[PDB]
Design a protein around this ligand. Sequence first.
Ligand code: ANP
Ligand code: ANP
Lengths: 741, 741
Amino acid sequence: KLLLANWGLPKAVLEKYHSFGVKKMFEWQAECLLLGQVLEGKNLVYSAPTSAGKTLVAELLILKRVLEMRKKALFILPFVSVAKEKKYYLQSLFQEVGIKVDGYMGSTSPSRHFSSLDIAVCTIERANGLINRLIEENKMDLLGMVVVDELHMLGDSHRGYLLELLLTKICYITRKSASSNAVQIVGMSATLPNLELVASWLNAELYHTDFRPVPLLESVKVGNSIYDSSMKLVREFEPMLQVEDHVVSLCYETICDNHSVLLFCPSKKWCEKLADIIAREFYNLHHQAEQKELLEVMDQLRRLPSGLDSVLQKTVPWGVAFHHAGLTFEERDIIEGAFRQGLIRVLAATSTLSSGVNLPARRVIIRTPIFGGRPLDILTYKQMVGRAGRKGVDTVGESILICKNSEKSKGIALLQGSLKPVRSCLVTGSMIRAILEIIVGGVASTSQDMHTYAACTFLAASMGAIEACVMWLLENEFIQSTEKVYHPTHLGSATLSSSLSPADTLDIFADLQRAMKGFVLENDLHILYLVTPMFEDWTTIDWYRFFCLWEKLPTSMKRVAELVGVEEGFLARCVKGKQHRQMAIHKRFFTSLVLLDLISEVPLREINQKYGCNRGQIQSLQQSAAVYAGMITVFSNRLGWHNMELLLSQFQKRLTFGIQRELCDLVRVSLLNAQRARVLYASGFHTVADLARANIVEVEVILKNAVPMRTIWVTGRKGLTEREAAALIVEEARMILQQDL
Amino acid sequence: KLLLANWGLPKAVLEKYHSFGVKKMFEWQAECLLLGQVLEGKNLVYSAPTSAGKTLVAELLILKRVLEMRKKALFILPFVSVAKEKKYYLQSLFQEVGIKVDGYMGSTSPSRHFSSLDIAVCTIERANGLINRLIEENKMDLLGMVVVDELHMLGDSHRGYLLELLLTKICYITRKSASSNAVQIVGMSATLPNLELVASWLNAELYHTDFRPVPLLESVKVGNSIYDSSMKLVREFEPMLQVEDHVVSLCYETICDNHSVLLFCPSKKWCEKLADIIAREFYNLHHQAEQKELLEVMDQLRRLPSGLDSVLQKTVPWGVAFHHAGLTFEERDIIEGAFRQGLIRVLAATSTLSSGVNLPARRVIIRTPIFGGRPLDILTYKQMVGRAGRKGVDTVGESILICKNSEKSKGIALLQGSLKPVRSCLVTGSMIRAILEIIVGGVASTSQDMHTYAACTFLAASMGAIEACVMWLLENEFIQSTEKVYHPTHLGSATLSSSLSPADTLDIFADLQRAMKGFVLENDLHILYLVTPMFEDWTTIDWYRFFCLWEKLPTSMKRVAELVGVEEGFLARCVKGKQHRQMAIHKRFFTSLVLLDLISEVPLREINQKYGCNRGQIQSLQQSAAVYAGMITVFSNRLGWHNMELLLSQFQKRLTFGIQRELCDLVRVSLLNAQRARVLYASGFHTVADLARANIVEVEVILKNAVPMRTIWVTGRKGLTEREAAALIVEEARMILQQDL
Ligand SMILES: Nc1ncnc2c1ncn2[C@@H]1O[C@H](COP(=O)(O)OP(=O)(O)NP(=O)(O)O)[C@@H](O)[C@H]1O
Ligand SMILES: Nc1ncnc2c1ncn2[C@@H]1O[C@H](COP(=O)(O)OP(=O)(O)NP(=O)(O)O)[C@@H](O)[C@H]1O
């Protein structure tokens, strides 16, 4: 029974599963999938280590649900990058079966309707919106199963509470319809201490396991000695070659064993220093002073829109590199992609890689127990050390945390500690949106029926302020009260449909209605100023630069500032020598200035040295501001503002790819991000129409030129050959036009 | 040789010509078509009376040109209504031949490209723009023949000068390309005294004839006697029944002879009085106190968007009616259509019908020699009296002009007078556009080459200020000068492409750029305020109403007024008790207010009693403001303003049909003007897509209701049955979607 072909599976899916190297099913997976009555409708929650094969159980369950009862199945993932990876994996597994898979990851939206789709690999922030849309116009029959990844995120997190509200809405809808099951909620988590309470929250059966494909031997350093988890020496450390910490040696010993190493570092600047240091040691310690495939990685990074990083130039062709937030989104994918093939053997990464894609390694080394002035989180530590040990190759997995002097006490607590139990995070902004997500949906109107929903939440299931949320919504016109029955309003129907927090919608409605009387149209700044999300922590603002920004702006760009409350008298002037709502406007104004150059196709290299924020912190905004333009536009339609939806209709597409209005039709094909379309635009193909009929060999020469074998990089496809990439552009264009009419 | 089938013609065209009652060719037409070498390339100009068969020669020539050398052939007509009639006639003649005919009449634009088209039945104002577009991007090879109707209009007229510039541009292009002919210019005119000079202007051969199918016996009244043209009594008048002028008797004598009468009147108010008077006499003089088809006309006018006119209620079912400018555009077509079938036997019309469609009658009576305080124009008189005598039925044709006391001297001069020779009307606004139409087109750049064009104009060919036009264009940035070679600018390339007079473009560029900094989006007023043409003489403005207009406008509509220079202190306030640019703003503001209700689908009955201007003067603006929005939008694209072209893209379609943004896709089918789409919209079909797939029998019931056998009226199709009209809606929708992709 522990064999995949024995289980009922499609032939093509099984063959592709062999192609991915998965053909042996562990005992824990079979036991979880044989937990009695789970399969035929009841929801399920299980825990396993990060490398135990958590995905396979969910994939088998969603396959069984899909081919048994035809119904749309969700797939919730916490991060956009992992969501894209999961969608591509599911497509590569499900091409033939006819299960059309596509995802809703922030800026991007499917061309085909959700009814045509069958599996929606969606992020939490947009899965909430999709389920709100489904619940709105009574389309619940299509949904048949919601799959959630990393259930433990529903605690203290910026987006796990959205997952909590989504799951409680689904549970309440299921309970109210019964006054074996319509929608099955299957989730995966780490070693959650209170998973029984979570399992009872959805009344799901629980199966917790600690099976690991390879043993994990966590260890700590003391001078020239290594101590195991339980304060026990396991191996007497000795240095091989170095020119107390000796962090370069631990990489070296694994290097001579023909394996790889992950070297997590606290800060990006530390990552650049550490990657450079290890590269220099590879000169003297290996030369006393695959290569061919490693040069291909260099070639792929050479004609990236940002070019090749200066620090990466002196490090990459040695198996030593670095990968953190400040790097480009395309640069990160290549560097991570090189690790999957083993081309790069050392990665000096930050804490961002902890929650990233599945990146295996033989050894994991963590430089400091303090990350950004605070002790490193246990949840992050478990995710970091969960990457030690490659399945089927490495016989063991080692994690080495470096602690010094008095800091060793904090380090030891991490090894013997356990991840904290989940919380509720529920007046509060989470409950206000929770209440508004139902009444405007019309599912529950009466207070008593609404109070039933309050008993279906996570806070109630763990074992006042619920009615206070209504009183806040009533005072702000969001919901009107009649004989008490609560009805949605024009503003309320817009907050829910656009998927905005009610705290923000109040200001946006006042901010957008401040554009009722005064507007400009020469420059996109004022229109862009209405789609900048916030200042948050996207970058550090340099005011002396803003002094240069303010004067050199044309006579129009300064006019926009006066129209939005920005004062010329105090603009980078009084800050040098030394109001919360006013400070959040000048910083918001600066955020709009950067986005203006982003849609003007100013290259990221220039925009970095000009606005001081590197490409990592800039794509962290344009892919976050593109979603904002996709919610302000929806906010206007539900409020009956057809004038500005027309203006803001194309600004989500212009911010996602950083293009102008000319390439809007051209960037529809997925193989032209921001440079493969302009160089193709200059060749005379101004629309996706004639590009489909364009000559196959003609587009080869145009893509060859304009350089700032598989050197062309494609989103989600790693690197691609120049001939293959250009051949797929016309092939994809033919399908795009054919399926759109 | 005087027989159509003898001439080389397609079989289907010949059969349709028999269907239209034209099978005998007069001697003058054959002589004109056998004027030696005219046929194989040389242009032609000929004159004939209004009923002599002027169209047939042009139709034969354009047919020969089209089937001999495949090339696009123009068809220029002076008025929009006659252009629509000519386009429909040409389509009804040319369905089978494959000659795709379509017209460019102001607001409407062809869905198919001009390259697909073969005959463009275009008005002068848009024929000029089409030829400018053709000359711009060197597409002159497609054009092979330009046909012009009423050549004599190129004199003192508001749009004949555009025809003059068009023809001189064509002639200059032909002459410059020769440094039997590419483009043949064939035109028709009345008895122009100086047609030889016009014929030599295009070097065309001239054939002037005075043949008339029926003799015309013009006559004048004196008390109870009738005098012929040459001061000779021809018949002693006697009154039959009346309850000196005795204008009701002349209708009566023709009535008992089973014929019809046209009774032209000076003013609309006179027309209502005269039509009512004759109807009352038909009570006592015919009852001492076809009917079935006459009631059908009443039924068609009963559910018109404006309903049935009060004055028409007491007059229509007796053969007596009236038709002037103040009536609805749809009302005029039915009243005129009833005359073609003979249902209505008396028409009290104004001078507007003189240049309208071909409306024949047995007798024509003109009430006064003074029209609006001035002597009646001889050109109008010839057009008015040219409708006397129906070909093949009436043995004679009579025109009776009524003169009294000392006014008889002026009346006699009209009978013995002749139509004045054409003029040039060429600093002047006609020459400024003439010069700009070429240099921005790039055809002529050097001054000497430009001076060659000045010798190809009508003023030169009849036998300084040409260089002064360049000096005016240079001072206003319209054209830049280098080493002298004149180049177009950004503003210059927009004035020519949008087809605006350079005098107006200077203000529009300043007016539109006054919207650079201050704009509103809640209401369409400010956007509509940028597309109102002018105040002109569209209606008389009542200021006390504007006082009611100003206060009851919302807090936003008053904000728009402040943004465009309108002052609250002086707004319908100082005019009651008693600046040219300021007066043309408040009047322009009032023009925008009316258009706001026009796009809000406020019914014409309410909008008449609310804004005091009847439906005749209101559709005289919305079909003139729709063209303006079609030129402001083009003016923005050539000037690189993509923000407001998006806002103004749909405002030409919203003003042509007076619809909202919901029906924009629905009104694409020609059988839904402004009421057949809303009542169909309320049935659930929100788009032209599902309307094509809509059930045939289902749309029958929805069109039957909402009434404010062939009762449904279709533009250009007279009246249509309810079953046929609804059946064609789905049939047309199927072809619209199929041919658009
Ligand atoms: N029974 C199995 N035997 C061998 N390999 C397996 C088995 N089951 C799953 N796998 C694979 O081994 C990996 C261990 O599972 P797991 O690491 O939890 O997935 P994951 O990292 O969460 N993938 P993702 O959702 O994209 O982040 C899976 O991702 C599969 O690639
Ligand atoms: N040889 C002919 N014999 C009989 N009828 C003719 C002949 N030639 C033309 N006709 C028709 O008699 C009418 C007299 O010509 P004419 O009145 O000048 O056309 P029109 O009124 O200018 N048509 P339009 O261009 O739509 O305004 C034509 O319109 C034709 O309908």
